[PDB]
Scaffold this active site. Structure first.
Site, PDB file in Angstrom:
ATOM      1  CB  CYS A  80      28.407  42.611  34.457  1.00 21.31           C
ATOM      2  SG  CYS A  80      29.817  43.290  35.346  1.00 21.31           S
TER       3      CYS A  80
ATOM      4  CB  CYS B 229      31.915  41.315  34.354  1.00 22.66           C
ATOM      5  SG  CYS B 229      30.909  41.623  35.828  1.00 22.66           S
TER       6      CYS B 229
END
Length: 117
Positions: A38, A41
């Site tokens: 991700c 993230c």
């Protein structure tokens, strides 16, 4: 500071059992749902550690979504990263997306509201 009492190390949560136990504590907790693949993230990893340093009265924990599908399902986490803010078993906020400043503002505001209630 006295809140330096604890260390600013971020906990990694490995089960629903552990998650429930941590959320039950009577201390403000920020639980950060993330995954290795991700992109957004990654941008919040270092802001999260700095926030753990700046808020030693706040518990910061990470929940890897690939490892903890059951928690993702139970909480209906729909996108990553997602931060959930809780205290004493009660859910008090959530910040969806990679925005460290929004999360910091929300933690500060929740602390103020809780203390001056």
């Amino acid at each position: 500071t006295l809140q330096q009492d604890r260390s600013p190390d971020v906990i990694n949560i490995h089960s629903l059992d552990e998650y429930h136990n941590i959320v039950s504590e009577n201390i403000l907790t920020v639980l950060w749902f993330w995954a290795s693949d991700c992109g957004p993230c990654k941008e919040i990893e270092e802001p999260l550690k700095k926030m753990a340093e700046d808020f030693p009265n706040v518990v910061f924990a990470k929940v890897n979504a690939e490892e903890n599908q059951k928690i993702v399902e139970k909480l209906n986490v729909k996108s990553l990263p997602t931060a959930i803010i809780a205290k004493g078993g009660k859910y008090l906020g959530h910040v969806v997306g990679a925005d460290p400043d929004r999360l910091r503002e929300k933690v500060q505001n929740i602390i103020a509201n809780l203390e001056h209630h």
